[PDB]
Amino acid sequence: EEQTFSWSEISQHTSANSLWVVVRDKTSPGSPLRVYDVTNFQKTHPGGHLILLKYAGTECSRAFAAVGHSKYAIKRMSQYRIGIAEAD
Ligand code: HEM
Ligand SMILES: [Cl-]
């Protein structure tokens, strides 16, 4: 199945010690807000670690799309999924 997270919980994950970001997945039925724990990705993210910290605890879908993240990047995302955010 799936694990749901509340925004009350997501919004706390704002430090480099435990960094979550949320990206809407328009390719999946229901367009879920997928929650990613990118803590262990900070050191290797090609965009750098600072930009991940900027959006920590928030939805970054628009910024993610504006970068034109590649198919390669999107494939690499799945390993960091922890669940989905509660719906709007
Ligand atoms: C798990 C989530 C993410 C993964 C796996 C990821 C992966 C990547 C990859 C592979 C690239 C190289 C370019 C490409 O292949 O398209 C990249 C570049 C970049 N990413 Fe991400 N990214 C993630 C989240 C984010 C988020 C949330 C932002 C916020 C905007 C971001 C900002 C950037 C920027 C700015 C670059 C390009 C840096 C430059 O070329 O100057 N990334 N990312
Ligand atoms: Cl996505």
Author numbering: 12 to 99
Source paper text:
5 is an essential electron transfer protein, which is ubiquitously found in living systems and involved in wide variety of biological processes. Tardigrades (also known as water bears), some of which are famous for desiccation resistance, have many proteins unique to them. 5, are distinguished from others by insertion of amino acid residues which we named tardigrade specific loop (TS loop).
5 proteins is a presence of a TS loop between β3 and β4. Although the TS loop does not form any secondary structures, the residues on it form a hydrogen bond network with each other and a salt bridge between Asp36 and Arg45. The TS loop shows few interactions with surrounding residues outside the TS loop, implying that it can flexibly move independent of other parts of the protein. One interaction is a hydrogen bond formed by the carbonyl O atom of Ser42 and the side chain of Arg35. 5 is thought to interact with proteins having negatively charged surfaces around their redox centers.
